[PDB]
């Protein structure tokens, strides 16, 4: 049952790694 | 230019000019420019007059007087154009507009703005205040 614990620890480490991972001057007076 | 004013300020300004004109020439003295502005409610101190004749001889003609009122009206209107331009952005009017509300109403305003320009616009700047939006528009 060590393979299931190693797979769960690897999935938790992968989830933790995934969680850790212009305009012109006249157009701006035009859009106003 | 002079198209910033409607017909109805210009017909009012010729009404004030032809009332106190000397002989129908279109002439006034350096006194009469003061009395023609205080006849309409606008009460500038004498520094506001002092620069405009330096900016235009002693003969103030009607195109010279029309250009001086146009600059006297446009500076306050260009300072206040942007708050009423901000009013359709927020529903209440205090100055607080949603970030989710701003990506369908600003991409659809008619200056051919794509999805890319307003995406550059808001991440070079939840709800943001009104005085920051002038800070981020005039830049």
Would you give an account of this structure?
- This is part of a larger assembly, with chains A (32 residues) and B (139 residues).
- Chain A is mainly α and 32 residues long.
- Helix content of chain A is 81%, strand content 0%.
- The termini of chain A are far apart.
- Chain B has 139 residues and is mostly helical.
- Chain B contains 8 helices and 2 strands, in the order αααααβααβα.
- Classes of the chains: A mainly alpha (32), B mainly alpha (139).
- The interface between A and B is small, with 7 and 13 residues.
- It is classed as membrane protein.
Short description:
Chain A: This is Ryanodine receptor 1. With 32 residues, chain A is an all-alpha fold.
Main attributes?
part of a larger assembly, 2 chains, A: 32 residues, mainly alpha, 81% helix, B: 139 residues, 50% helix, 3% strand, adenylate cyclase activator activity (chain B), calcium (chain B)
- 3D shape of chain A: rod-shaped
Q: Count interface residues per chain for the largest interface.
A: A-B, 7 and 13 residues
What's the helix count of chain B? 8
Q: Strand share of the residues of chain A?
A: under 5%
Structural class of chain A: mainly alpha
The biggest beta sheet of chain B reads: 2 strands, antiparallel
Task: Please describe the biggest sheet of chain A, giving its number of strands, its sense, and whether it closes into a barrel.
Answer: none
| Beta-strand content of chain B | under 5%
Total DSSP E strands of chain A = 0
Topology pattern of chain B, helix = H, strand = E: HHHHHEHHEH
- Gap between N and C termini of chain A: 67 Å
Percent helix of chain A, as a range, is over 70%
Q: What is the rounded distance between the termini of chain B? A: 24 Å
Which structural class is indicated by helix and strand composition of chain B? mainly alpha
Number of helices of chain A: 2
The total of beta strands of chain B comes to 2
Oligomer: part of a larger assembly
Write the element-wise H/E pattern of chain A from the N-terminal end onward.
Answer: HH
Order of strands across the widest beta sheet of chain B? Answer: 1-2
Whole-angstrom Rg of chain A = 25 Å
Subcellular location (chain A): Sarcoplasmic reticulum membrane
Family (chain A): Belongs to the ryanodine receptor (TC 1.A.3.1) family. RYR1 subfamily.
Protein name (chain A): Ryanodine receptor 1
Organism (chain A): Oryctolagus cuniculus (Rabbit)
């Amino acid at each position: 049952x060590x393979x299931x614990x190693x797979x769960x620890x690897x999935x938790x480490x992968x989830x933790x790694x995934x969680x850790x991972x212009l305009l012109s001057k006249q157009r701006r007076r035009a859009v106003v | 230019m002079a198209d910033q004013l409607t017909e109805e300020q210009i017909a009012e300004f010729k009404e004030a000019f032809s009332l106190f004109d000397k002989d129908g020439d279109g002439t006034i003295t350096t006194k009469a420019l003061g009395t023609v502005m205080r006849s309409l409610g606008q009460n500038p101190t004498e520094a506001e007059l002092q620069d405009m004749i330096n900016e235009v001889n002693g003969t103030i003609d009607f195109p010279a007087f029309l250009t001086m009122m146009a600059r006297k009206m446009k500076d306050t209107d260009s300072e206040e154009e942007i708050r009423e331009a901000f009013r359709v952005f927020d529903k209440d009017g205090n100055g607080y507009i949603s970030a989710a509300a701003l990506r369908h109403v600003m991409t659809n305003l008619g200056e051919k703005l794509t999805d890319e320009e307003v995406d550059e616009m808001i991440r070079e700047a939840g709800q943001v205040n009104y005085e920051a939006f002038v800070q981020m528009m005039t830049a």
